[PDB]
Amino acid sequence: GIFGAIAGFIENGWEGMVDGWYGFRYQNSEGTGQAADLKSTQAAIDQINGKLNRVIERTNEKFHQIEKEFSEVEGRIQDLEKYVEDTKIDLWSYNAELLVALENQHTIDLTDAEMNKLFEKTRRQLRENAEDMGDGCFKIYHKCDNACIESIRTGTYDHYIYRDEALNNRFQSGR
Amino acid sequence: GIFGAIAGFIENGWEGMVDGWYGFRYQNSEGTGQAADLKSTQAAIDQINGKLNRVIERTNEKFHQIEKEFSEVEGRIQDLEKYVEDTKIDLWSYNAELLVALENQHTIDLTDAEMNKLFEKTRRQLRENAEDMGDGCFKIYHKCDNACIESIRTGTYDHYIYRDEALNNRFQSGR
Amino acid sequence: GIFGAIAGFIENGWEGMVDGWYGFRYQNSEGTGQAADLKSTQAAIDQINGKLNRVIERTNEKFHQIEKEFSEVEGRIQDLEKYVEDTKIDLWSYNAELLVALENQHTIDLTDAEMNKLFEKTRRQLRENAEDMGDGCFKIYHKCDNACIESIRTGTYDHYIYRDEALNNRFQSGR
Amino acid sequence: NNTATLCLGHHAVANGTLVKTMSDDQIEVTNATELVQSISMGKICNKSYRILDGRNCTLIDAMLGDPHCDAFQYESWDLFIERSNAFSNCYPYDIPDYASLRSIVASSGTVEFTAEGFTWTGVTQNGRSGACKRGSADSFFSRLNWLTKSGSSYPTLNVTMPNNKNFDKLYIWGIHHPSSNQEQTKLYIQESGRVTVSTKRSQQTIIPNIGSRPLVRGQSGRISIYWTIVKPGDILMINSNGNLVAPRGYFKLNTGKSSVMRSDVPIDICVSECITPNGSISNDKPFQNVNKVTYGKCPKYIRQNTLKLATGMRNVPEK
Amino acid sequence: NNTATLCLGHHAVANGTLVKTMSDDQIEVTNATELVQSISMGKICNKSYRILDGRNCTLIDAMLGDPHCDAFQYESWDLFIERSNAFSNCYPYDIPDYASLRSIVASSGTVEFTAEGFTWTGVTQNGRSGACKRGSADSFFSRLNWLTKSGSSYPTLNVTMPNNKNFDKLYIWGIHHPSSNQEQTKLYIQESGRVTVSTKRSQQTIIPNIGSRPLVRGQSGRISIYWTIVKPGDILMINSNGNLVAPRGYFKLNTGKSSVMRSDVPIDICVSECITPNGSISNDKPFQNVNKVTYGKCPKYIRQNTLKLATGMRNVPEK
Amino acid sequence: NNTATLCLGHHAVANGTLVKTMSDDQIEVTNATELVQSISMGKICNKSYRILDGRNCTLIDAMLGDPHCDAFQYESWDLFIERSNAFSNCYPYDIPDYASLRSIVASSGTVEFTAEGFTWTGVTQNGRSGACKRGSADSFFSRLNWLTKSGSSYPTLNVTMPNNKNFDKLYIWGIHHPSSNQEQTKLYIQESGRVTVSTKRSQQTIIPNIGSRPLVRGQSGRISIYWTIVKPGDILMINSNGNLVAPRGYFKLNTGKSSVMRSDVPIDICVSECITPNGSISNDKPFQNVNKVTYGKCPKYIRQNTLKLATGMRNVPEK
Numbered sequence A, B, C: 001g002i003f004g005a006i007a008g009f010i011e012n013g014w015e016g017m018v019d020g021w022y023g024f025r026y027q028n029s030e031g032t033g034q035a036a037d038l039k040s041t042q043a044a045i046d047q048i049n050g051k052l053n054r055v056i057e058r059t060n061e062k063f064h065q066i067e068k069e070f071s072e073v074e075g076r077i078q079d080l081e082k083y084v085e086d087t088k089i090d091l092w093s094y095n096a097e098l099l100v101a102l103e104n105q106h107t108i109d110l111t112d113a114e115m116n117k118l119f120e121k122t123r124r125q126l127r128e129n130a131e132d133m134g135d136g137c138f139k140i141y142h143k144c145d146n147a148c149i150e151s152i153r154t155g156t157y158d159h160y161i162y163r164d165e166a167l168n169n170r171f172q173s174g175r
Numbered sequence D, E, F: 001n002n003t004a005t006l007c008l009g010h011h012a013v014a015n016g017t018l019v020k021t022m023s024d025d026q027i028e029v030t031n032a033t034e035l036v037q038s039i040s041m042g043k044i045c046n047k048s049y050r051i052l053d054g055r056n057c058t059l060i061d062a063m064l065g066d067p068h069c070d071a072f073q074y075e076s077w078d079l080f081i082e083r084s085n086a087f088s089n090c091y092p093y094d095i096p097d098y099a100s101l102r103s104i105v106a107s108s109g110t111v112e113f114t115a116e117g118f119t120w121t122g123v124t125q126n127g128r129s130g131a132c133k134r135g136s137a138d139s140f141f142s143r144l145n146w147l148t149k150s151g152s153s154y155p156t157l158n159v160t161m162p163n164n165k166n167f168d169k170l171y172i173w174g175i176h177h178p179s180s181n182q183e184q185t186k187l188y189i190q191e192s193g194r195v196t197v198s199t200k201r202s203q204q205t206i207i208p209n210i211g212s213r214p215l216v217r218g219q220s221g222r223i224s225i226y227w228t229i230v231k232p233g234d235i236l237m238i239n240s241n242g243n244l245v246a247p248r249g250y251f252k253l254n255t256g257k258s259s260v261m262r263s264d265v266p267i268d269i270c271v272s273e274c275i276t277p278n279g280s281i282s283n284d285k286p287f288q289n290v291n292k293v294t295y296g297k298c299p300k301y302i303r304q305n306t307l308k309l310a311t312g313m314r315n316v317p318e319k
């Protein structure tokens, strides 16, 4: 996908996440855990539900039309009835093929984007108190219990609070 | 949008910016100010003006055709005239519906991208002398008068000049 | 393009790279060099080869049809034959115009994305041991011989190894 | 430890599925739905449209009143079903532009007939034939009136019937081509017939052509069928010298959602809103590959038998 | 303070507007434009195309030369407008394949006529009728020549007219079906008529059918109209025994941008390049919902009455 | 130095090329391919389809058996090529609905004929004419049998020919319109002719019309051509009083990939799978602008003469 998140820097998906489409796993002072992110899951799904409805109008009633199968040869008029039906079917077949390709591309790309968006949003909160490990994980330079991890998932994490602590742990170096 | 800039990390738009589509607000030693970015505004607009012309050719003259309203029942030939016109109208209706959806998606996405592009371009200049606050703002670790802010908007900002100063202010810490 | 890599932060392309579509140039302790990145080159090309095949089915045989040129005036039936052919040609002409625009947009955008993806992937490896100079280059704070640069291109670069060295060189400052 | 790792991720499923994008011929996503209806119900549902089974009768025969089609007088339909094994069993006929009349009537959605009191003085009405047995008895198309000599003449007929109604009337009538001059003069006095049906705005004259055609139900003669639409305020007029097979009344043209379809699949007790010759099909997908002949609320017919629309993200199992 | 904050942003407007994307049914952007023309001007603009108002006349009557259509001889048009309240007021007629002839002439864009010196020896020319009054006087279609006996015969007519021009000539002619044998023999000596119009490559023979049709402007007889196209180098030949309603000359077929349209809306003094039955419509949008019948430089007719195309970014007011 | 710079980049070429996107009317990319075939080969390739050059003959003449078309009996084709300079050189004729018959035969892909032993008692067969010279000798359409009096009568003909085959038979036949009553009675005893061709399900009767038409190859008479399709189990019957131009047998209708095309470009020795009037065209692009008339495996005709599809990234040379 254009963002290189899914099937990119995120090495793979998690079969063990039944809770949602996107989310977090973590290892902290209280062991390990997992939580789904509902906002971004819902942003994806809203885009994908009823996707086709935004292009095709609800199916229309059609009643008497032209005949399309003929039991005798007639020439000119039958030739034209045949060609009209053929022209129509080919055009729709093209339409449906293209629609699928377009829509799917859109779907692939928007879901990559939601993943990336959520990574970015997380990184931005953490600010200088953490490191992008390059595989979709963050190294956080402080004691971050479940409550603290909960604060990051809910968007309430105040980075100034932990800054001095993360500084000490980060910069235990030089040499 | 796929970049999560507009209606994302940029909490909202500014009704007070009449000057352009994208730009900057700032608070420095000389108070507060606002400026439009013309490059990125123009990049958007160029893409959106005459957008439809890149898909539909200028409207064509059409003269004598087939009749489309009938005052008597006739059967076979009228059935075919009717079905031909119906087939055509349905196909165009599909076209126009899809076109709108596509184009709009494109429009939404390219304007998000211009915003993001401008944020990124700004961040890149600033380098280690500043911090992404997470809401589309940058915290700059030095006295940056209007001339200095002007240098960042025009792409002339030399970060080496301010580096030692921003280091002192950044790293007033540990504890 | 939506990522602002190509014709953006990458000031321009290199005529001297015949080796691939994307890659690296570098200046280190052993002088200067150049290498193509094959993964990302191949990711682009795979998307662009046979692109049109994913929308148009292989060309179909069509045999006897309707006549399309007439040597005498006849009225109703000829009017309809003409209008049917016209309707069809116009619809296909629209299709082909739109297809081109769509596909090209896709092509432009995916190639921008591959470039950006590769920059990002590189930055992520380097971590705190390097700086984004803003023009598609990285400043690396240590002796990085050809073997070391090779490790970054192949994805094997261990950043912990060089961290203390890059710290010393980075933070030769304050004042 | 006094640090922490926070990892970001997305879901995956075990058994994923392949779709096509603008970028890839095939790529695995978590889920997808079929957009093409490939499968028919195998029967034609008796709801929600009014379906009428021709059984042994074509639409035209039902409307002309071929005796074995008597059960269809009075009937109307949303969709009339014609079967392969339908047969005619009355006097052998032909209709110039058969198809157009079949379409007009199909479209109208009824063969309900409204008799009018045409008066035909100096001829004998209700001509019968052994080709066309209603019971033991010789008979004829019930909506048509075979006219012949009374006594030893057949006078120029000159009959009107004005349309004072709100609507267009449809009149079905015909002419008899006999197999011999001896049969001509026997039935109609004159040696040459003629029929001229006119209105204020249109007319059609037919002259019969004596002679043998191949035997069909013991007849080498034939009947040719014509029709005439008569608008409000306008007037039907019939002028004939001999050989007229006359109308008994009119069909009412409704502007209808009605039609006709050729199929051999049985009708059965189920519910659906789209009908094809293969049977009713489901309605929930946008496209279908069952038949280009459809009636009702139908997905659009295309040449592909399958199209997969992703409804989930790229599926990436553990490497 | 000795630091600074630099904020990035975009504009917004107070009163934004909703559009549809591939992602959302409805989402607010700063601005958008209508792509569908919903509204007609209510009149038909007299520029920039040449519009001709049929008023009381159909295109066919104008071309045949029905007396109340005399003002239309000499005329040509880009678009001929036919009104509901048009009427015929000459001898009652019919045209097999009326529509095709209406289309051929409409397409040609003129009823200008070029008389030729056909010579008809042994018959009386310029037949008149009380059905067809030009002034107080009995008269007839001006482009047609009703031929009858001179004295006490009507000889086999055998007349040619070669086409030595660059172009196809269009010839309009007809046959008279009278209401009585007594009127037949009175007008034309023979008891049966015939007309055979031929060229090197084509021919059409018609035989008239005596008898009463409904009275129209005091006539129970009728005229049937035919046409014949004669190519360069080719030759018109007319052969008749009686009952011929003869041509006086030819219409020139131009290959035209010309047409005909049915409408009752008034013509008025304005400017436009697309015409419909509802009136002229504006041209600047790519689609329209006013009418499927159009002429000129027209947006494409679709079923939707509105479609909004974003021309600005997502509008995000203060939360 | 003890640091390093690592730069990221992409390729560029010297001579790039312009394409259109949704965002730009024109933007330079590294490479692109034409999607529209603009150029024709200039000749019609003799492979891979079976092409047959009408040369001097129309498809109809080849099938009727005009003497200069004798070389075409026995022939079949995927595509029959008709030339502008083709001419008829037998008895002057006309076909009502010529085009439909041309289409039926073209579609069938052969003029191979299967003679049947019709027996015509009491008339003389093999009528010849100076309009239609096969050698020095007078002759006639080879697939047709001109029938006239034997001695001093021409009896009512009543002839059958049943179809006991698997397939529909196509029968071509005609009627002779003579130029004088004196020629009528001379050739056929009766003063009026008639031809009635029937099956169990259909019939067509034609009456000839005496009189002069313009001279063509010394003839002012004419022949009108008709056809009749006879289904399996069904029976051809012919009933005539005079003036019959009779069939000698049937053409077999195949359901074919076959057709006919009008072109003047020469046929030549090359290979291709799409044919137009301008010549064969290449097949590798998805669209073409050469001609809307095509046959074979063809790109789709559109109005644009060029469309460029990018096959590389945005090309950005040094600034």
Ligand SMILES: *[C@@H]1O[C@H](CO)[C@@H](O[C@@H]2O[C@H](CO)[C@@H](O[C@@H]3O[C@H](CO)[C@@H](O)[C@H](O[C@H]4O[C@H](CO)[C@@H](O)[C@H](O[C@H]5O[C@H](CO)[C@@H](O)[C@H](O)[C@@H]5O)[C@@H]4O)[C@@H]3O)[C@H](O)[C@H]2NC(C)=O)[C@H](O)[C@H]1NC(C)=O
Binding pocket: D038, D039, D040, D277, D278, D289, D290, D291
């Ligand atoms: C919905 O209903 C439609 C009909 O409206 C069905 O579409 C039609 O399907 C049928 C068959 O499934 C197709 O009919 C064939 O048409 C072709 C072309 O003309 C013809 O070759 C074929 O002949 C078949 O019957 C012959 C009669 O004896 C066989 O001899 C013949 O050859 C076979 O010979 C041996 C003998 O067993 C076989 O072993 C060989 O393999 C050989 O093939 C063959 O069986 C049929 O007449 C028809 O083309 C098709 N389409 C149309 C538009 O009519 C749909 O199938 C149906 N759709 C769904 C989803 O149910």
Ligand SMILES: *[C@@H]1O[C@H](CO)[C@@H](O[C@@H]2O[C@H](CO)[C@@H](O[C@@H]3O[C@H](CO)[C@@H](O)[C@H](O[C@H]4O[C@H](CO)[C@@H](O)[C@H](O[C@H]5O[C@H](CO)[C@@H](O)[C@H](O)[C@@H]5O)[C@@H]4O)[C@@H]3O)[C@H](O)[C@H]2NC(C)=O)[C@H](O)[C@H]1NC(C)=O
Binding pocket: E038, E039, E040, E277, E278, E289, E290, E291
């Ligand atoms: C451009 O011009 C076109 C015409 O070329 C207009 O399109 C047409 O619009 C008209 C009406 O606006 C439509 O005509 C109707 O057709 C339907 C279907 O057959 C028919 O039901 C309807 O009947 C109307 O008139 C009757 C005559 O008395 C009424 O009795 C009848 O029922 C009403 O009864 C009472 C009495 O007042 C009402 O209160 C009830 O509400 C009830 O409805 C009804 O009024 C018309 O004959 C026509 O379908 C339509 N389309 C076409 C293709 O012809 C366009 O409107 C115009 N476009 C623009 C943008 O101006």
Ligand SMILES: *[C@@H]1O[C@H](CO)[C@@H](O[C@@H]2O[C@H](CO)[C@@H](O[C@@H]3O[C@H](CO)[C@@H](O)[C@H](O[C@H]4O[C@H](CO)[C@@H](O)[C@H](O[C@H]5O[C@H](CO)[C@@H](O)[C@H](O)[C@@H]5O)[C@@H]4O)[C@@H]3O)[C@H](O)[C@H]2NC(C)=O)[C@H](O)[C@H]1NC(C)=O
Binding pocket: F038, F039, F040, F277, F278, F289, F290, F291
């Ligand atoms: C494939 O083959 C098709 C044919 O199937 C070609 O398409 C056709 O091309 C021709 C010409 O290239 C077009 O024919 C013209 O049709 C127009 C419209 O009716 C007509 O104006 C034009 O007249 C030409 O010939 C006249 C005869 O004397 C000239 O007098 C006339 O005017 C000219 O006068 C002087 C005299 O020299 C010139 O100097 C002036 O400039 C003036 O123009 C003119 O030459 C032709 O009859 C035809 O419209 C077109 N399309 C169709 C659908 O038929 C394709 O070109 C071909 N395609 C490819 C790729 O090879």
Ligand SMILES: *[C@@H]1O[C@H](CO)[C@@H](O[C@@H]2O[C@H](CO)[C@@H](OC3O[C@H](CO[C@H]4O[C@H](CO)[C@@H](O)[C@H](O)[C@@H]4O)[C@@H](O)[C@H](O)[C@@H]3O)[C@H](O)[C@H]2NC(C)=O)[C@H](O)[C@H]1NC(C)=O
Binding pocket: D212, D213, D214, D215, D220, F158, F159, F160, F235
């Ligand atoms: C012009 O020539 C045609 C061609 O022959 C003549 O038509 C034929 O006329 C004869 C004389 O009557 C008919 O004969 C009989 O048909 C009766 C029924 O035929 C069938 O029935 C049996 C079963 O009972 C089936 O098994 C057969 O397959 C038949 O379909 C029969 O009952 C009766 O006794 C005679 O045998 C021919 O049937 C008929 N053929 C056709 C094609 O019309 C026509 O009479 C003649 N006209 C003239 C000379 O003026």
Ligand SMILES: *[C@@H]1O[C@H](CO)[C@@H](O[C@@H]2O[C@H](CO)[C@@H](OC3O[C@H](CO[C@H]4O[C@H](CO)[C@@H](O)[C@H](O)[C@@H]4O)[C@@H](O)[C@H](O)[C@@H]3O)[C@H](O)[C@H]2NC(C)=O)[C@H](O)[C@H]1NC(C)=O
Binding pocket: D158, D159, D160, D235, E212, E213, E214, E215, E220
């Ligand atoms: C075959 O039968 C038809 C059916 O009746 C015969 O046609 C009728 O012939 C009669 C005899 O002449 C015509 O009578 C008259 O019509 C004149 C005008 O009629 C109207 O004018 C008044 C106003 O002046 C209107 O209010 C009416 O609504 C009428 O339209 C009238 O001036 C004259 O004095 C007679 O009263 C019939 O009108 C006519 N009807 C039709 C439908 O043609 C036809 O004569 C006959 N043929 C035969 C026996 O050979």
Ligand SMILES: *[C@@H]1O[C@H](CO)[C@@H](O[C@@H]2O[C@H](CO)[C@@H](OC3O[C@H](CO[C@H]4O[C@H](CO)[C@@H](O)[C@H](O)[C@@H]4O)[C@@H](O)[C@H](O)[C@@H]3O)[C@H](O)[C@H]2NC(C)=O)[C@H](O)[C@H]1NC(C)=O
Binding pocket: E158, E159, E160, E235, F212, F213, F214, F215, F220
């Ligand atoms: C009804 O009137 C028409 C119109 O005139 C009569 O048709 C004409 O009949 C005459 C009398 O025979 C024909 O005369 C001749 O034609 C022969 C060949 O003509 C041409 O050949 C030369 C070269 O040899 C060419 O250069 C010319 O351009 C001609 O095409 C000729 O050999 C013979 O000696 C006569 O001169 C007319 O040709 C013919 N014209 C048409 C248009 O048919 C028709 O006879 C008459 N019917 C009646 C009175 O019952």
Ligand SMILES: *[C@@H]1O[C@H](CO)[C@@H](O[C@@H]2O[C@H](CO)[C@@H](O)[C@H](O)[C@H]2NC(C)=O)[C@H](O)[C@H]1NC(C)=O
Binding pocket: D031, D032, D033, D311
């Ligand atoms: C896999 O895909 C199908 C199709 O999207 C899902 O089932 C649909 O759910 C929608 C609404 O969410 C309902 O209208 C129907 O129940 C289903 N629609 C169709 C067209 O089949 C299903 O939820 C998905 N399965 C899993 C395991 O996630």
Ligand SMILES: *[C@@H]1O[C@H](CO)[C@@H](O[C@@H]2O[C@H](CO)[C@@H](O)[C@H](O)[C@H]2NC(C)=O)[C@H](O)[C@H]1NC(C)=O
Binding pocket: D055, D056
């Ligand atoms: C359709 O026609 C068939 C054939 O005429 C009818 O079946 C016949 O019915 C009679 C009396 O009911 C039997 O004696 C015959 O032997 C039957 N023939 C066959 C071939 O089955 C049948 O009744 C008609 N179908 C309907 C629905 O009326």
Ligand SMILES: *[C@@H]1O[C@H](CO)[C@@H](O[C@@H]2O[C@H](CO)[C@@H](O)[C@H](O)[C@H]2NC(C)=O)[C@H](O)[C@H]1NC(C)=O
Binding pocket: E031, E032, E033, E311
């Ligand atoms: C809102 O949208 C309309 C439509 O885009 C704008 O008006 C158009 O401006 C174009 C060129 O920029 C001109 O061709 C016309 O004056 C208008 N075109 C149409 C189709 O209406 C308008 O600028 C926008 N309004 C605001 C306040 O920004």
Ligand SMILES: *[C@@H]1O[C@H](CO)[C@@H](O[C@@H]2O[C@H](CO)[C@@H](O)[C@H](O)[C@H]2NC(C)=O)[C@H](O)[C@H]1NC(C)=O
Binding pocket: E055, E056
């Ligand atoms: C169209 O026809 C009407 C009806 O014949 C004409 O109006 C008549 O004109 C005469 C004399 O000018 C009046 O005495 C009649 O009373 C009018 N009748 C009606 C019903 O108004 C009208 O002149 C014709 N229109 C045109 C444009 O020629």
Ligand SMILES: *[C@@H]1O[C@H](CO)[C@@H](O[C@@H]2O[C@H](CO)[C@@H](O)[C@H](O)[C@H]2NC(C)=O)[C@H](O)[C@H]1NC(C)=O
Binding pocket: F031, F032, F033, F311
């Ligand atoms: C420029 O573009 C053309 C078209 O893409 C390239 O040539 C094609 O290469 C494909 C497969 O890669 C082959 O099927 C054909 O040889 C060519 N196809 C067509 C349609 O022309 C070519 O490689 C490109 N040129 C350069 C210098 O990169």
Ligand SMILES: *[C@@H]1O[C@H](CO)[C@@H](O[C@@H]2O[C@H](CO)[C@@H](O)[C@H](O)[C@H]2NC(C)=O)[C@H](O)[C@H]1NC(C)=O
Binding pocket: F055, F056
């Ligand atoms: C097509 O017709 C022309 C014209 O009849 C034929 O060419 C003639 O051939 C004869 C004898 O071979 C010559 O004496 C004539 O002078 C030729 N006339 C012309 C105008 O060239 C030609 O043979 C026919 N073409 C084919 C392929 O049979």
Ligand SMILES: *[C@@H]1O[C@H](CO)[C@@H](O)[C@H](O)[C@H]1NC(C)=O
Binding pocket: D014, D015
């Ligand atoms: C998936 O498919 C496997 C292999 O075919 C099969 O054994 C199993 O029933 C399915 N399991 C799941 C979890 O879908």
Ligand SMILES: *[C@@H]1O[C@H](CO)[C@@H](O)[C@H](O)[C@H]1NC(C)=O
Binding pocket: E014, E015
């Ligand atoms: C916008 O709409 C409001 C509410 O309907 C109305 O009072 C006002 O006139 C409009 N104001 C602006 C700035 O568009």
Ligand SMILES: *[C@@H]1O[C@H](CO)[C@@H](O)[C@H](O)[C@H]1NC(C)=O
Binding pocket: F014, F015
């Ligand atoms: C490119 O074009 C230039 C200028 O037209 C020409 O001299 C040269 O032959 C071409 N060179 C390359 C490298 O394509």
